[PDB]
Write an enzyme that holds these catalytic residues in place. Structure first.
Site, PDB file in Angstrom:
ATOM      1  N   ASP A  69      14.842 -16.286 -54.967  1.00 37.33           N
ATOM      2  CA  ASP A  69      13.823 -17.177 -55.504  1.00 37.33           C
ATOM      3  C   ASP A  69      13.528 -16.797 -56.977  1.00 37.33           C
ATOM      4  O   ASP A  69      12.371 -16.664 -57.407  1.00 37.33           O
ATOM      5  CB  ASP A  69      12.623 -17.097 -54.594  1.00 37.33           C
ATOM      6  CG  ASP A  69      11.558 -18.173 -54.845  1.00 37.33           C
ATOM      7  OD1 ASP A  69      11.762 -19.215 -55.511  1.00 37.33           O
ATOM      8  OD2 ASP A  69      10.432 -17.925 -54.347  1.00 37.33           O
ATOM      9  N   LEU A 106      -7.630 -14.546 -58.728  1.00 39.18           N
ATOM     10  CA  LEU A 106      -6.599 -14.937 -59.662  1.00 39.18           C
ATOM     11  C   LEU A 106      -6.028 -16.291 -59.281  1.00 39.18           C
ATOM     12  O   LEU A 106      -5.836 -17.128 -60.148  1.00 39.18           O
ATOM     13  CB  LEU A 106      -5.524 -13.856 -59.779  1.00 39.18           C
ATOM     14  CG  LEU A 106      -5.802 -12.810 -60.864  1.00 39.18           C
ATOM     15  CD1 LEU A 106      -7.249 -12.813 -61.346  1.00 39.18           C
ATOM     16  CD2 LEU A 106      -5.376 -11.426 -60.410  1.00 39.18           C
ATOM     17  N   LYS A 149      -3.148  -9.383 -52.820  1.00 37.52           N
ATOM     18  CA  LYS A 149      -2.758 -10.536 -51.974  1.00 37.52           C
ATOM     19  C   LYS A 149      -3.381 -10.424 -50.558  1.00 37.52           C
ATOM     20  O   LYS A 149      -2.995  -9.520 -49.774  1.00 37.52           O
ATOM     21  CB  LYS A 149      -1.245 -10.521 -51.817  1.00 37.52           C
ATOM     22  CG  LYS A 149      -0.521 -11.844 -51.802  1.00 37.52           C
ATOM     23  CD  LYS A 149       0.711 -11.655 -52.696  1.00 37.52           C
ATOM     24  CE  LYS A 149       1.989 -12.305 -52.155  1.00 37.52           C
ATOM     25  NZ  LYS A 149       3.057 -12.163 -53.248  1.00 37.52           N
ATOM     26  N   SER A 199      -5.331 -19.306 -55.670  1.00 35.65           N
ATOM     27  CA  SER A 199      -5.726 -19.815 -54.347  1.00 35.65           C
ATOM     28  C   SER A 199      -4.851 -21.026 -54.037  1.00 35.65           C
ATOM     29  O   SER A 199      -4.071 -21.016 -53.077  1.00 35.65           O
ATOM     30  CB  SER A 199      -7.222 -20.203 -54.298  1.00 35.65           C
ATOM     31  OG  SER A 199      -7.876 -19.718 -53.122  1.00 35.65           O
ATOM     32  N   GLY A 224      -1.236 -17.905 -50.067  1.00 35.15           N
ATOM     33  CA  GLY A 224      -2.635 -17.470 -49.907  1.00 35.15           C
ATOM     34  C   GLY A 224      -3.415 -17.182 -51.198  1.00 35.15           C
ATOM     35  O   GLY A 224      -3.327 -17.941 -52.168  1.00 35.15           O
ATOM     36  N   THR A 225      -4.133 -16.050 -51.215  1.00 36.44           N
ATOM     37  CA  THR A 225      -5.336 -15.830 -52.061  1.00 36.44           C
ATOM     38  C   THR A 225      -5.406 -14.463 -52.831  1.00 36.44           C
ATOM     39  O   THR A 225      -6.097 -13.520 -52.388  1.00 36.44           O
ATOM     40  CB  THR A 225      -6.591 -16.011 -51.141  1.00 36.44           C
ATOM     41  OG1 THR A 225      -6.458 -17.261 -50.450  1.00 36.44           O
ATOM     42  CG2 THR A 225      -7.919 -15.992 -51.889  1.00 36.44           C
TER      43      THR A 225
END
Lengths: 296, 296
Positions: free
Chosen positions: A133, A22, A46, A24, A25-26
């Site tokens: 956030d 989805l 994740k 790119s 972490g990744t």
């Protein structure tokens, strides 16, 4: 001060298959096939060790929250690279969706979104958790009429008889932040309200960038001279007035997530009084169940 | 790299009387009457020559450690059968105590125990010593609020600029062992942390047997597929999260004994926020002194 009895389910990597990337972490799209349960659950996976402390604090927060408008963790996987297994939100984040469908979104969607994000934020108040956030990039779209708050990287649980979270240093998204947060690194539920204010603004402007081409070093100065983000085209003054209240300088003066639910809710009953808009899987999908229907 | 100036006191068998058999090598309850000192010290006496090398390496390690949370050696006796003289821990090992008092132990005891074992393990870090056999069976109970780490049969002192202990062959308790230890026979202080993780789990489950009815030959496979021991009933997620971190695959990612002291300590201040539990000598005993008060 009550005991937190959330469960953390540890998963085998044998029980789930990645499929595509989805991001790119990744993050990966994937499918989770638990235990021996005749169910296949679409998941986002994740995939140092600073990164590990970070990713397990996230797992902690995410495990201990349970709401229809808050991202759902299904478990972790204690492989070398630690893995978060979450509910898949096929439509991606709200910033993008709103940008990619700018031309086709109505009052009704917009307002319901403001409602569902307030509901999620209020639940976070109840659980004494502070997100820190909040932004359209950190809302996920399950279906276009159902969104969820995500990304608890910065989330902090408020202690016993503790009402603020004094932060240390650390990179922070300034343009979404309250003034007390930015000057004094103090964070409250009210603080989160300010960001709500800007999240709403991202949505009303169909995904504009707050304070485009301005220095984050300036922002603090501006806010204090008394400038705020401008009234989007689409917005009744009724709606804009609500954002502006979220950006009041005295944090106690701002609205509570409670009131924001009520306000946007009244508005979502007559959407066009309040916003003026022009135009208003695959494979063997048989044992598929969405995370929301997979309880334990 | 500093000189180790521990003293090894050699004792006459004339100075101590056995009394009963604690176990069956062959531990005895006894009383030690030193020199001419108007004191009687309650002791446990551990009574080839592979067995002798083994038992003097143990004596070596045990003599060179000095902490309230680490088993105390009072001396040896160089009789045909070599003898270890230790402090008597009347309440026996922690595995049993926890099993024999399952129904009557509270949050406060449990957490303080997690603290006292971390304190002992941290001291062992400082002394650059690696225990390699940490488990509830290898903690002794002096009084119910004061426990000590014991059984240094497998303990190894780390050398100069040496951070691992590569083992040879030898029977090893697999279910308490870190993954790097089991695949590659590497042992570090972090490795010991993993076992701490399982020791805590033995305690939280009131003395269950890790991975009951499973093959030690399997264990390694499991750990790698990403399975861990399940969350005990009694445990807040806060506590369980700590165990899980102890079982992280990247050893550097796990917590240090230092941090574990801090974490369990915070928790022991409000025990019931963190654990949810239902129910929360003889003869002329005049010159009796416990080992802890017998210094030199």
């Amino acid at each position: 001060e009550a005991p937190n009895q959330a469960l953390l389910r540890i998963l085998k990597e044998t029980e789930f298959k990645k499929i595509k990337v989805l991001s790119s972490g990744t993050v990966y799209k994937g499918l989770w096939i638990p235990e021996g349960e005749k169910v296949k659950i679409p998941v986002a996976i994740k995939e140092s060790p600073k990164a590990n402390k970070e990713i397990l604090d996230e797992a902690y927060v995410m495990a201990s929250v349970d709401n229809p408008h808050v991202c759902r963790l299904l478990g972790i996987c204690l492989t070398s690279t630690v893995q978060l297994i979450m509910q898949l939100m096929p439509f991606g984040c709200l910033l993008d969706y709103v940008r990619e469908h700018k031309d086709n979104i109505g009052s009704q969607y917009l307002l319901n979104w403001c409602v569902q994000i307030a509901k999620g934020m209020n639940y976070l108040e109840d659980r004494r958790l502070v997100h820190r956030d909040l932004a359209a990039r950190n809302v996920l779209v399950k279906t276009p009429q159902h969104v969820k708050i995500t990304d608890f990287g910065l989330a902090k649980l408020l202690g016993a008889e503790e009402k603020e979270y004094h932060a240390e240093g650390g990179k922070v998204p300034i343009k979404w932040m309250a003034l007390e947060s930015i000057l004094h690194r103090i964070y409250t539920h009210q603080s989160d309200v300010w960001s709500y204010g800007v999240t709403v603004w991202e949505l009303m402007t169909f995904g504009s960038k707050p304070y485009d081409g301005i220095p984050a070093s300036e922002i603090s100065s501006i806010l204090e001279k008394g400038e705020r983000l401008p009234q989007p085209p689409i917005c009744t003054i009724d709606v804009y007035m609500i954002m502006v209240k979220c950006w009041m300088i005295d944090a106690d003066s701002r609205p509570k997530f409670r009131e924001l639910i009520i306000e946007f809710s009244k508005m979502a009953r007559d959407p066009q009084r309040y916003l003026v808009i022009q135009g208003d899987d695959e494979e063997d999908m048989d044992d598929v169940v969405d995370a929301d229907e997979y309880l334990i």
